Ligand binder design. Structure first.
Ligand SMILES: [Cl-]
Ligand SMILES: [Cl-]
Ligand SMILES: [Mg+2]
Length: 205
């Protein structure tokens, strides 16, 4: 599209699901993690946060880590609630779009995420009418299952290799410029949506 595109790799954060850093911060202060900002910066993740993203630690360990940094007992589900408040919604017109794109492309998800967040979006964002997450994607490639994260070159190679697809026939939509620049090196074509951009214009005749 015109470019012999057969496959789409779709990012999750921003591109599909709206995010809210401030709300997450506030909810974390509320439960008594007053210095949440010192320790957390999704723009440049560190420590346990980076670790969970590559699946180097379990959710249980993530929660102890959080408990330890807070110096205070706070229940698993209270921790999960604050962490999950980062995630907002996938607008249903994006789900419609993914469903429509199935007619012409094989569609994959490639996402830096973690087990807590993933379970939340599978439960709360993807279900729609009769559909679930499996309905939208041939496969979902998640950093914490792959033990790698964007923008490592190795992740884009692991995906095209695992999927049996040709990078030059693949189009990647990710709101991170660095992610896209690295994918381009492998010959993947890319588009970098702005925050809140409805990128369905990419598909118009
Ligand atoms: Cl909606
Ligand atoms: Cl990501
Ligand atoms: Mg993103």
């Amino acid at each position: 599209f015109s470019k012999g595109i057969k496959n789409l790799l779709i990012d999750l954060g921003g591109v599909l699901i709206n995010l809210d850093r401030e709300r997450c911060i506030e909810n974390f202060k509320k439960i008594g993690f007053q210095n949440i900002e010192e320790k957390f910066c999704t723009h440049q993740l560190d420590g346990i946060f980076l670790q969970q993203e590559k699946g180097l630690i379990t959710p249980a360990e993530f929660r102890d880590g959080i408990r330890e940094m807070m110096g205070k007992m706070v229940s698993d589900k209270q921790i999960d609630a604050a962490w999950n408040s980062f995630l907002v919604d996938i607008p249903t017109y994006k789900l419609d779009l993914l469903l429509k794109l199935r007619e012409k492309y094989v569609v994959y998800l490639l996402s830096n995420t973690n087990d807590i967040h993933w379970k939340w979006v599978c439960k709360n964002a993807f279900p729609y009418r009769t559909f679930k997450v499996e309905d939208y994607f041939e496969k979902t490639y998640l950093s914490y299952e792959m033990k790698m994260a964007k923008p490592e070159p190795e992740i884009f190679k692991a995906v095209t290799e695992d999927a049996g697809i040709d990078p030059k026939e693949t189009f990647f939509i990710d709101d991170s410029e660095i992610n896209c620049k690295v994918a381009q090196e492998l010959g993947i074509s890319t588009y970098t949506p702005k925050a809140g951009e409805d990128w369905s214009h990419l598909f118009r005749k």
